[PDB]
Amino acid sequence: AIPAHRGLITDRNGEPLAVSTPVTTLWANPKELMTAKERWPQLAAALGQDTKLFADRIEQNAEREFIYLVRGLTPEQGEGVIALKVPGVYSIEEFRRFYPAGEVVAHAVGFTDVDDRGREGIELAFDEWLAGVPGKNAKPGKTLALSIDLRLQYLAHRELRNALLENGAKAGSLVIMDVKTGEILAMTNQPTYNPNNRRNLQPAAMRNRAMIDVFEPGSTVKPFSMSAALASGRWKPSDIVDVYPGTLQIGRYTIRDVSRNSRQLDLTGILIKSSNVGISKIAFDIGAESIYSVMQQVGLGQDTGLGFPGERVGNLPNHRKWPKAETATLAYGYGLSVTAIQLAHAYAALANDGKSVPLSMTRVDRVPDGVQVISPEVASTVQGMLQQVVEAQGGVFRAQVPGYHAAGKSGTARNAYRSLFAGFAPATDPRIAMVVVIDEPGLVSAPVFSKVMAGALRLMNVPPDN
Ligand SMILES: *C(=O)N1C[C@H](NOS(=O)(=O)O)CC[C@H]1C(=O)NNC(=O)[C@@H]1CCCNC1
Numbered sequence: 275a276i277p278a279h280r281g282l283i284t285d286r287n288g289e290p291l292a293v294s295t296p297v298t299t300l301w302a303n304p305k306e307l308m309t310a311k312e313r314w315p316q317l318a319a320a321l322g323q324d325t326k327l328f329a330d331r332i333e334q335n336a337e338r339e340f341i342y343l344v345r346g347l348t349p350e351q352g353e354g355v356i357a358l359k360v361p362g363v364y365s366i367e368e369f370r371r372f373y374p375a376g377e378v379v380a381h382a383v384g385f386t387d388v389d390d391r392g393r394e395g396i397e398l399a400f401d402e403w404l405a406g407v408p409g410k411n412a413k414p415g416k417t418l419a420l421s422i423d424l425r426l427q428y429l430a431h432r433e434l435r436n437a438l439l440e441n442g443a444k445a446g447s448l449v450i451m452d453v454k455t456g457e458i459l460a461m462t463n464q465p466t467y468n469p470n471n472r473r474n475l476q477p478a479a480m481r482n483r484a485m486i487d488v489f490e491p492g493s494t495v496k497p498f499s500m501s502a503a504l505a506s507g508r509w510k511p512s513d514i515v516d517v518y519p520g521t522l523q524i525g526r527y528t529i530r531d532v533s534r535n536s537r538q539l540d541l542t543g544i545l546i547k548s549s550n551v552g553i554s555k556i557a558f559d560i561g562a563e564s565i566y567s568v569m570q571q572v573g574l575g576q577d578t579g580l581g582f583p584g585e586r587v588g589n590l591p592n593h594r595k596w597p598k599a600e601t602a603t604l605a606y607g608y609g610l611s612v613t614a615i616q617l618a619h620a621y622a623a624l625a626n627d628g629k630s631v632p633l634s635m636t637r638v639d640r641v642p643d644g645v646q647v648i649s650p651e652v653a654s655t656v657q658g659m660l661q662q663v664v665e666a667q668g669g670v671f672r673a674q675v676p677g678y679h680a681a682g683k684s685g686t687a688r689n690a691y692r693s694l695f696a697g698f699a700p701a702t703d704p705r706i707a708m709v710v711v712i713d714e715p716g717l718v719s720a721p722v723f724s725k726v727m728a729g730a731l732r733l734m735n736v737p738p739d740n
Contacts, residue, residue, distance in 0.1 A: 275408050275409075276408060276409030276411075276412045277368055277369055277390060277408055277412065278369075278405065278406035278407055278408050278409070278412040278413060278414055278415060279294055279369055279406070279412070279414035279415065280292075280294040280369055280371065280386070280390055280404055280405060280406070280414075280415045281403065281404040281405075281406070281414070281415030281416045281417050281418055282294075282417045282418075283383060283396060283397075283404070283417075283418050283419075283420060284417070284418075284419050284420070285379075285419070285420055285422050285423060285424035285427070286419060286420065286421060286422065286423050286457070286459075286637045287423065287424070287425075288419070289374075289375070289424045290374050290375075291373065291374065291375055291379055291383050291420065291422070291424070292371055292372075292373055292383055292396075292397065293371070293372050293374065294369040294370065294371055294390070295369065295370050295371075295372050296349065296367060296368075296369060297345075297346035297347060297348070297352075297368050297369065297370040298346070298347045298348070298349065298351065298352025298353070298365060298366070298367065298368070299342065299344070299345045299346060299347075299352070299365075299366040299368045300321075300342075300343040300344050300347070300352060300355055300356070300363060300364070300365065300366075301340060301341065301342055301343060301363075301364055301366060302332075302340075302341050302343050302362050302363050302364075303339055303340070303362040303363075303364075304332055304335045304336055304338055304339070304341055304362070305336070305337075305338075305339060305362070306361050306362025307332050307360070307361070307362040307363070308332070308336055309361060309362075310360060310361040310362065313358070313360045313361070314328060314329055314332065315328075315329075316358055316360070317343075317355070317358065317360050317363065320354065320355045320358065321343055321344050321355065343355075343363065345368070345388065346368060346370045352365060368390075369390055370390075371385060371386045371390060371397075372470060373385070373468075373469045373470050375424060375427075376468045376469070376470060377431070377466045377467065377468050378424070378427055378428055378431045378462075378466075379422060379424070379427055380395075380466045380467050380468070380469050381394075381395060381461065381462075381463050381466065381481075381482040381483075381484070382395055382396060382420065382422055382427075382458075382461050382482075382635070383395050383396050383397060383420075383469070384396055384397040384398055384399075384469070384583075385397055385469040385472065390405075391405075392404070392405075394480070394482075394583065394584075395482070395582070395583070396418070396420060396582075396635060398583045399580075399581055399582050399583055399635070400418050400636075403415065403416050403418060404416070404418060418636065419636065419637035420635060420636060420637065421452075421457035421458045421459065421634050421635050421636055421637055421638065422458065422459065422460060422461065422635075423459045423460065423733070423734075425733045426450055426459045426460040426729070426730050426733055426734075427460045427461075427462060429460075429726060429729040429730065429733065430448045430450060430460040430462045430726055430730075431462045431466075433448075433722055433725050433726045433729075434446050434447075434448045434462055434464055434710070434712075434722060434726075435464055437710075437712060437718070437719075437721070437722045438464050438712065441712060441715035441718050442715070443712045443713050443714065443715040443718075444465075444713055444714075445463075445464055445465065445478075445483065445712075445713040446463070446464050446483070446692075446710070446711050446712040446713055447461075447462065447463045447464075447483040447484040447487065447614045447709075447710075447711045448460065448461075448462050448484075448614075448708070448709070448710050448711070448722065448726060449461055449484050449614050449615055449618040449708065449709045450618075450706055450707075450708050450726070450730055451618050451619065451621075451622045451633075451706065451707045451708075452622075452705070452706070453621075453622040453625040453626040453631075453698060453704050453705060453706065453707045454626060454631065454641070454705070455631060455634070455638045455641050456619075456622070456631030456632050456633050456634050456638065456641070456642075456644075457634050457637070457638050458615075458633065458634065458635055459706070459730070459734075460730075461484045461485075461615075462484075463481065463482060463483040463484055465478060465479045466479060467479040467480065482584055482585075483614070483711065484613065484614045484615055484711075485580075485582060485584060485585040485586065485613055485614075485615055486584050486585065486586050486613070487586075487613065487614065487711070488586050488588045488589075488611045488612070488613060489611060489612065489687035489688060489692055489711075490607060490608045490609070490610065490611055490687055490688040491574070491607045491610070491612050491617055491685060491687055491694065492606065492607040492608065492685035492686050492687050492688065492694065493548045493606065493607060493683055493684060493685030493686070493694075494607060494617060494683050494684075494685040494687075494694050494695075494696045495569065495574065495606075495607035495610070495620075495685075496544075496545060496548065496553050496605070496606060496607065496683060497545065497624060497656050497659070497660055497683055498565070498568050498569050498572060498574070498620065498624075499553050499556070499557060499565050499568075499604075499605040499606070500541060500544075500545065500553075500556075500656055500659065501568050501624070501648050501652050501653070501656050502560055502564040502565045502567070502568040503541065503556045503559075503560055503564075504541075504652045504655055504656070505564065505568070505648070505649060505652050506559075506560040506564055508559060508560060509541060509556060509559075509560075510541070511540060511541045511542055511655055511658070511659065512540050512541075513540065513541060514538040514539065514540055515538070515539055515541075515544060515549075515551075515552045515555050515556060516537055516538055516555075517531060517534075517536045517537065517539055517544075517547075517549045517551040517552045517555075518536065518537040519534060520533070520534025520535075520536065520549075520551060521534070521551065522551045522554060522555070524554075524598050524599045524602060525598070525599075527599045527602075529550050529551055529554055529602055530550070530551075531547070531548075531549050531550055531551050531552075532548065533547045533548070533549070536549060536552075539552050541556075541659065542658075542659045542662050542666075544556070545659050545660065545662070545663050545683065546662060546663050546666050546668050546669050547668065548683070548684070548685075550602070550606040553602075553605045553606050554601075554602035554605055554606065556605070557601050557602055557604070557605035558598060558601060558602075561596070561601070562593065562596030562600065562601040562604055562605070563596075565601075565604055565605055566590070566592060566593075566596075566604065568647075568648065569590055569604075569610065569620075570590060570592075571630075571645075571647035571648070572619070572620040572623045572624070572630060572647050572648070573616055573619050573620060573623070573630065574588070574590055574610060574612045574616055574617070574620055575587065575588045575589050575590025575610050575611065575612060575616070576590070576616070578613075578615060578616060578619065578633050579632065579633070580615075580633050580634075580635055582635065585613070585615070586613060588610070588611040588612045588613060588616060589610065589611050590610045590611075590612075591609065591610070607685065608688060614709045614711050615633070615709075617694075617696055617709050618696070618707050618708065618709040619633055619707075621696045621697065621698055621707040621708075621709065622698070622707040623644075623647050623648065623653075624648065624653055624656055624657065624660075624698070624707075625657070625681070625698035625704035625707050626644065626653075626704065627650045627653050627654060628646055628647060628648030628649055628650050628652065628653030629644035629645065629646055629647070630644055630645050630647045631644045632644075657681055657698075657701060657704070658701075660681035660682055660683060660697065660698075660701075661679055661680075661681045661701040663681070663682060663683055664680050664681060664682055664697070665679070670682065670684050670695075670717070670720050672717050672720045672721045672724060673695060673697065673720040673721075673723050673724055674724060675699050675723075675724055675727045675728050675731070676724075676728060677728070677731075677738040677740060678699050678700045678701075678727075678728070678731055678736070678738055678739055678740060679699065679700050679701035679702060679739050679740055680697055680698075680699040680700070680701065680723070680724075680727060681697050681698050681699065681701045681704070682695055682696055682697020682698070682708075682720075682723060683695070683696055683697065684716050684717075684719070684720055686716065687711070690713070690714060691714050692711050692712065692713055692714070693710075693711075693712045693715050693716065693718035693719045694709070694710065694711060694719055695708075695709070695710045695719040695720045695722070695723040696708070696709045696710075697723055697727070699727050699731060700731070700736060700738075700739040701739070702739040703739070705731065705734065705736050706727060706730050706731065706734070706736075708723055708726060708727055708730070710722045710723050710726075
C-alpha cells in the first residue's frame with residue numbers, strides 16, 4: 275500500500291482549501307525489534323512515548339510483522355528517528371491533509387480520517403474523484419475547484435459571528451447562491467471548528483446547519499403562496515383583501531396577524547405587513563393544491579440532488595385534499611419543513627425570472643439549462659412586491675442595501691424559534707440570493723442580510739442599480 279497524493283481542493287478562484295502535504299510514517303517489524311530490546315527506550319523517547327507502554331505494546335505483538343509507531347512526522351523529524359538505525363524500524367512517505375482556511379470553510383470542505391479517506395463534507399462527497407488509487411504505481415487524485423468564493427465565505431463568516439454576539443445567539447447559518455448558475459458562493463454555520471486540530475470537538479460545532487437543520491420557514495414562503503395566487507388567474511397585485519380586525523376564526527382555530535392596523539390590503543400590502551389573515555383568505559380562494567404545487571416545483575421539502583453527506587430533505591406533505599386550517603397553515607409556512615439551502619434555492623428560482631438552475635457545490639463552467647417553475651411574468655411581479663417589502667414605508671428598512679435595490683422577506687421559523695431573512699439583489703437584474711438563520715436570538719437577521727449582501731455585490735463587481 276503506497277498511498278496516492280489526494281487531489282487539491284481550491285475555492286472558485288483557485289485559493290487552496292485542502293492540501294495533502296508529504297509526511298513520514300515510521301512502522302516496525304516486531305520480530306526484528308525483539309532482537310534489539312536495548313534500543314527500544316532511545317526509540318520511545320524520540321517518539322515522546324512512555325518506555326513501559328512502548329515496550330508492553332511491542333512485547334504483546336511479538337508474533338506479528340507490521341505495527342505503526344508514529345503517523346505523519348515532518349520531513350526532518352522522521353529522518354532523525356531512522357538515523358538512530360534501530361533494527362526493524364523503516365520509513366513510509368505518506369500524505370497528511372491541511373486546511374489553510376480553517377474554521378472559515380470547515381463544514382463545506384469537511385475533512386479526512388487517519389487513512390486520508392473522506393469523513394465529512396466535500397472530502398467525502400467527492401472522495402472517489404479526490405482519492406485516486408494506491409500502489410502497481412500510485413495514480414494521484416484530481417484537483418476540485420468548489421463553487422465557494424473564499425472572499426464571500428470570509429465576509430459571511432465574520433458578519434454572522436458578529437451578529438451572533440450582538441444578539442447573544444448561540445448558533446446560525448448563512449447561504450449565498452449565484453441565482454444564474456446554481457452555485458453556492460458561500461455556506462457558513464456557527465458554531466464552527468478548526469479541522470486542522472481535531473482533539474475534543476463539541477459535536478454541535480460539527481453540525482452543518484445550512485444542510486441538516488430542518489424548520490418550518492413561516493413568512494418566508496408567503497412569496498410562493500403569492501406566486502400561486504398570481505398564476506391562478508383570480509388575483510392581480512392591486513386586488514384588495516379585507517384583513518380587519520387582524521384575526522380570522524377557522525371553526526375552532528384562530529389566525530392572528532402580528533400587525534393589526536389594516537382593513538383593505540392589496541397583494542403587495544399583505545407581504546409588507548406579512549398578514550397571515552390576508553394570505554389565508556387568498557389561499558381559501560385558490561385552494562392548497564396550487565400552493566403545494568408551486569412549493570414542490572421550487573424544491574421546498576424536495577431532494578436538492580447535491581449528493582452531500584448528512585443533507586436532510588425536510589417534508590412538504592401532499593394532503594391531496596386540504597381542509598381550511600391545513601390550507602392556511604401551509605400558505606403562511608407552518609405545515610412544511612425545509613433547510614436553509616432549499617429556501618435559498620427557492621429564492622434563487624424567484625430571482626432568476628422563475629427559472630430553477632440545479633444547485634452546485636463545484637465551480638460551474640457550463641451552466642445546465644434551468645426549468646421554468648414559475649412563469650416569467652409572475653416571478654417578475656413577486657420580485658417587484660419583495661422589493662417593496664424592503665423599500666416601502668412600514669417595510670423591513672434594516673435590510674436595505676446601500677447603493678443597490680434589495681428584495682426579501684423576514685420570518686420566524688419553528689418549540690424552538692429561528693429568526694429568518696431571505697432575499698436577492700439587485701432587484702433590477704438579480705445576481706445573488708441569500709438566506710440568514712439566527713437561533714432564538716424580524717429585525718435580527720435583516721441587518722446581516724444588508725451587510726453581507728453589500729459586501730458580496732461589491733466583491734462580485736455588480737454595478738449599483740440605484
Ligand atoms: C412570519 O414568520 N410571521 C408573520 C408575522 N410577521 O413576520 S415578520 O416578523 O414581519 O417577518 C409574525 C411572525 C411570524 C408568525 O406568523 N409567527 N407566529 C404565528 O403567528 C404562528 C402562530 C401559530 C404558532 N406559531 C406560528
